[model samples]
Target: LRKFKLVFLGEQSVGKTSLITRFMYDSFDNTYQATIGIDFLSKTMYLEDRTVRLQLWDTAGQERFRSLIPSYIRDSTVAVVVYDITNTNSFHQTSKWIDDVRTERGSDVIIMLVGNKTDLSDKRQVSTEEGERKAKELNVMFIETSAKAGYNVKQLFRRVAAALP
Candidate 1:
């Protein structure tokens, strides 16, 4: 079986943990808790053609933990940089996160830009077009998701897995 190292990054409370929770448990909690430094999770995905293991490294959104994240990013097969669609600052902050990934892994890594909290459409500050444009500019994959509504959550992982060679 193939194992892929996936690192999660974004500003705090951008649903980084919530997306993993939804994917791993098919559950979502309304409550929020900051991930201290790094959270590690693994899932065995059984797709139509193959079964692969995903090693998920969930990083803290707090600035204090920023120094501790690059170590995890170094060997990652994929880096998922997420942002809160309702928070413009969170969206802009994703650049630093992507930069960190590129610095450590360079072109060897697959980076995905994710816009979370689509369920809060009324509160969205980042448009889908903007997200797509940014992804195109960065030459990375992009998708929108709602962990609470379970929209595009599985597709996110599936796309990453399919991208994995």
Candidate 2:
């Protein structure tokens, strides 16, 4: 089994918990979720070969937590940063938001740019392909997921699992 820390970092109210929610329960929808430090969520599952256990190093809205990057980041498989698909400003802000991981690990790390709220695609301010292009430009990966309607959630982690090794 491979033990790893998967940290989800993005903006407040931008579907951080929803990813975990959608991934775990597959029934959970919506989020105004609370943030906590270094939440340990252990899991035993089949993913090709590596049985996995994880500590979700969820960071708060402070630069202090950014200091914790050096610890688990080296074991990184993905730098997942999510944003509101309905909110252009929030998506644009991910450039700065991703700077820490980029700054810490540089091109050594692979990232996944996630755009949530596809169920609200009518309200979407950013085009899905634009984020895809951004992912290409960043040399990372991108995916569109709707936790509200539960689409493409498993493939999100499947991609991560395949990306794992």
Candidate 3:
């Protein structure tokens, strides 16, 4: 199996943990507690010619635990910087996550900017154009998704998997 490491970064309650869980296990719990330091999960997907294993790291979003980020991000092949559609602060935190990954992993890491909870469009505070622009500036892929509705979750993973090197 081909192995790849991925890290999820975003602010607290941005649905970063939920998104990963939903994608890897097809499960979601609204009352899930906030991640403390870090959490790990893995999923194996069969591509056309190979089975790829994704090592996903769900890191704590609290400021006090930010120091632990480097350890998880080191040598990562891909990073998914998630943000809540309805939370501007979460969207802003993506910049810090992207920068941290770039500094630790280098310029070639395939980073994806994900604006999650697209189903909450009525409460959205960050515009798609803004997220797209940020991704463009970082020269990374971008997608808006809704884990609750299963919208674009699989597509996001598939596209990222295809882009993996």
Q: Which of the two, 1 or 3, has more TM-score?
A: 1
Using lDDT as the measure, which candidate wins?
1
Q: Can you write out model 3's per-residue Cα lDDT over 20-111, one digit (the tens) per residue?
A: 77877798887968899988877787765788787888898889889988988885788889899999989988998899988987777888
Descending-TM-score candidate ranking: 1, 3, 2
lDDT of 2: 0.72
**Cα distance off (Å), candidate 3, residue 160:** 1.1
Better of 1 and 3 by lDDT: 1
Instruction: Return the top candidate by TM-score.
Output: 1
Which is the winner by lDDT between candidate 1 and candidate 2? 1
For model 2, how does the per-residue alpha-carbon lDDT over 80-155 read when each residue is reduced to its tens digit? 7888899897798778767767777887666788898899988989998999999888777899888777787777
Collision count for each candidate, in order: 0, 0, 0
* Model 1 residue pairs with clashes: none
RMSD per model, one decimal: 1.1, 2.4, 1.4
Off by over 4 Å in 2: 29-31, 61-75
Q: Which ten residues in a row have the lowest lDDT in candidate 3?
A: 41-50
TM-score of 3: 0.93
What is the Å distance of residue 161 in model 3 from its true position? 0.8
How accurate locally is residue 58 in candidate 2, as Cα lDDT from 0 to 100? 54
